[PDB]
Amino acid sequence: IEPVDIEQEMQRSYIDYAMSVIVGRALPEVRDGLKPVHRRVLYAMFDSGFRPDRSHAKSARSVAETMGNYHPHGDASIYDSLVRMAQPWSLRYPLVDGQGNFGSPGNDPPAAMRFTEARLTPLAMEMLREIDEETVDFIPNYDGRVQEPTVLPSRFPNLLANGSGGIAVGMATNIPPHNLRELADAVFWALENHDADEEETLAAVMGRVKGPDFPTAGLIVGSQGTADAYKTGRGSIRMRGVVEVEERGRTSLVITELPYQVNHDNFITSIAEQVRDGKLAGISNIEDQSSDRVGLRIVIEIKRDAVAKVVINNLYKHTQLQTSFGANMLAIVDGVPRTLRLDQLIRYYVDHQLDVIVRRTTYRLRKANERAHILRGLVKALDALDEVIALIRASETVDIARAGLIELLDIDEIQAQAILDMQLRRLAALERQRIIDDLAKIEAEIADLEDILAKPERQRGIVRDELAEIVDRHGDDRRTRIIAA
Amino acid sequence: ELVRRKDIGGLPGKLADCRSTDPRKSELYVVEGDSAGGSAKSGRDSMFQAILPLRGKIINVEKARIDRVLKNTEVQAIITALGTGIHDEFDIGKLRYHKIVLMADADVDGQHISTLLLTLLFRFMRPLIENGHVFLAQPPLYKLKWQRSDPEFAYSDRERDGLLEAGLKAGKKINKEDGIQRYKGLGEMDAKELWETTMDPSVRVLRQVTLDDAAAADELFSILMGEDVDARRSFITRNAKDVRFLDV
């Protein structure tokens, strides 16, 4: 029975836990902007087929395939993780499409796993685009029986579009969301200006990313915090709701918008707990007149011996009607935690997109050369077709046919087998010229691919073209409006 | 001697006690999870081994003010199952089990749970470490399912690759498809496995927790477990770098 010093054990164990949480649970990879649990739910969904062309799958099947093949922790906190990705008051660009009761902006919980249905969204298909083309390193899973992606191609700047938020050990991260079109203007800059430095790029992006854009609308008040956060990785951004005064002989306060991540039920309860305390006089009654048809609507009749501006500002003060989003841009870069400026986030994502397109082009090239090296042996079999048919028929086995095929022409075993497997269908007139034409087209494509691998100018071009395809189809108007103070 | 719940108890409900009445031969397994505690209730030697399972993570007793801690049912359970008492009221004469085995997953969350467990023991019950009562049980990582012969268990990828090589070289035979079962926690094990690998005295792999210096432990605990976030951040940043090279 070996001894162990309590000091050594406490150290080795707490360090292992804390580094595991920092790198593999709480904090988002900088490229695709995902924690592991997110990457593994999206990936098991993709792999299972639950795409938007096909009918929503019972939401228990995604949890089961995620925990079975990739993510060995509890079904409970995988259902919750999946559910959050389908709430539109939680994701500015939701990645899961939910049929059923997925909660509400308040405290209504979601229906149990057995009731809901769920599939991927089109943008989430763009997180996975061409993941089957060697565009990302895969590693073996928790039991080696299958493989998982370390990262997703993330053909849109997900980390900034959707934010992240997470408590780790010794630190914590809170990246807000942003408008996809604005983020794409900044990425377009970093592409047209690839050689530019950090001073210049930080200037240009801060100028195209006017600030956070929250799913919940609302307002950002003050330009400083936005700018702090983007320039130093940390900053305190004050958000406000929207109040709409309405004048039976009664004057009212209608809240239609709130700051991101403000619980609607806890909000009402705080007003009613500070009017029960009696430190927000001036209110006749609080009534949630809210429903799915009118949206958020918390009408707040006020007393006829109270003024509107005064009471609004009391609410800004004592409640979360205004409140402060405390960014700490923190993400995992190359396996380690790093706080980052807005120029380091955009650039790091961009370098990822270029990585992905030079990898996909490498894959496409190798497969083109495979198919061409085959086609070449087939056309050599066509120009001497009578010799080859006669040879095979006269052979005794298929290996003997094959050896004779490699004798007659100058082909590999791959090429001789590809002629052997060749079906009679292809020895028709139009089909032989199809083989010829095909060899020609594939050599053209091979040239195009070599050319793209030579020229980074071309690789940045493909990123701009494909991301604008995406942003035109899926981008949307800015929600949170920006004011000054 | 001490009386063990049977029908009349006066002890925790989750506790599954032992038949023996003599603390010098009795052992209490504190076990992460009700699945794993349940399957250790079955695999044990009912004579001498008791089982207190824990729902997941325990309360951090160093961040948590003394009052919330005594109202916490799991901590109150761990205390009642030991008989001693806490702080100045502690009495090792009333100790119920002369071996206390912490058995948690071989995953980082079992390390966190065995860290929340050794923080409690050290602050409320220091003497139990000082006298070498508190052990840690090392769970296995692989079952090797030879075809014709008994399975082997393996506690490190080194041992797994050694046992696979040695058996194959001895002419033993193993399926490629279902042949080596990697465990990811104690809940994945039946009662016979738990016995044959962490509860049978004759094949157990325990580690005795000792205390060289109760003053640098005091500051270590303070750093890792307490409310000073900066001290933590600095500690992890200083020591994460050299985790792969501590035993060379």
Binding site: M19, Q344, Y348 | -
Partner: peptide, 12 residues
């Protein structure tokens, strides 16, 4: 966890 790279060279 060693303090290398940051911009250029990524983070190490």
């Amino acid at each position: 966890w060693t303090x290398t790279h940051x911009x250029f060279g990524x983070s190490x």
